[PDB]
Symmetry: D2
Subunit: 121 residues, 4 copies
């Protein structure tokens, strides 16, 4: 993969990948593992989000991509998706701001840059 690493659930600023994406690039992502978004026995989340026996608001406690401070859904993974903005790829466990203190665990994530933007001319 172009980047592989952990995404800690307690990282409020996310995990920086160092991948500098440009508008028009395409990427794929797969995310593995489990994290806690709280201390309770039920407050587990996959990258796709909280276990549905304790659901949270939309996009909360899911794996998202942050690019130029805009957030995009990733969850368990995405295949060959076009990047609409420039910026470094930050992978973020999208917990409510200020509530990362009771989080633990990390996802294992792989990112592939499938293509760099170049149009037909």
């Amino acid at each position: 993969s172009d980047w592989s690493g952990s995404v800690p659930a307690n990282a409020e600023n996310g995990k920086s990948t160092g991948l500098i994406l440009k508008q028009g690039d395409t990427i794929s992502v797969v995310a593995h593992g489990w994290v806690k978004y709280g201390r309770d026995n039920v407050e587990w989340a996959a990258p796709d989000g909280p276990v549905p026996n304790n659901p949270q608001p939309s996009s909360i406690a899911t794996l998202v991509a942050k690019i130029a401070n805009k957030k995009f859904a990733i969850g368990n993974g995405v295949l060959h998706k076009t990047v609409p903005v420039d910026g470094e790829l930050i992978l973020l466990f999208n917990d409510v701001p200020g509530t990362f203190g009771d989080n633990s665990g990390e996802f294992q994530v792989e990112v592939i840059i499938e293509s760099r933007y170049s149009p037909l001319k």
Copy 2:
């Protein structure tokens, strides 16, 4: 995607994709969603497997690929993996045989054939 569809947790024989894979092909898979592998409130599973607060034996209640009656790990997804055997791709919720009766729900899965085998000559 080359194939997108549901993989029911209660399907003991899995979900046939119709994709005929050859040794040397490469594929990518991403799987989303939640299933129950039992009627208890804790018996939830992501494609990666059971929620860790109620763990099961290795590979049980995970999403796997069946090709020529061999099983391969898939879970939440894989990127650009080489197919080692010829056969139709079957996607299977790998519950213990005979225990699919209390399963429910389905994963949403996407499969892409990234390349068909062709060697440098």
Copy 3:
């Protein structure tokens, strides 16, 4: 390949690949072989164009892609290029209109649809 076939040099309307493309798709192409754009011994062309010892105007007697009646350079090939317009992919030996009658031969061309447009959201 998603499409493989011969592109005749004397086909003033090009060769249909049957591939229906959408803006934002990415494609790769490789083209092999040799054609004649005239009866003279010097009037050979690779997909990239005429041999430089008998140059023709820009883009003339080169392999191009025709989509929605717009022309894009292909030549010997392109890798993971973004498609800017919807339409059927036509491959065309871009000879001067009305001068296809003295052409002969065909390029062997392979086309791969690397991805179908799907943005991060």
Copy 4:
């Protein structure tokens, strides 16, 4: 691209790309341009080989890939081909040994490592 650069026709040892390939990787290549394999006005070659109005023996004056001192056809390009041996990718204008002194020009070549070997398990 993973590597893009020039392949001089007069480089008897070829052009080292620095790409370290492993058995099972897949690669794509496209090659553009024209070179001379001799001082005569007719001794032009595309990556696919000599212009057919002055043909040479089979495989001579064609663009090939050298991996572990073995030669593989490339010509104008290849798409998603599996690498059969470990080694650095060397791109070579395959002229007769000792006859590179009368060559000039260079091909413009792009190489993409489409995937790094990882099997389903």
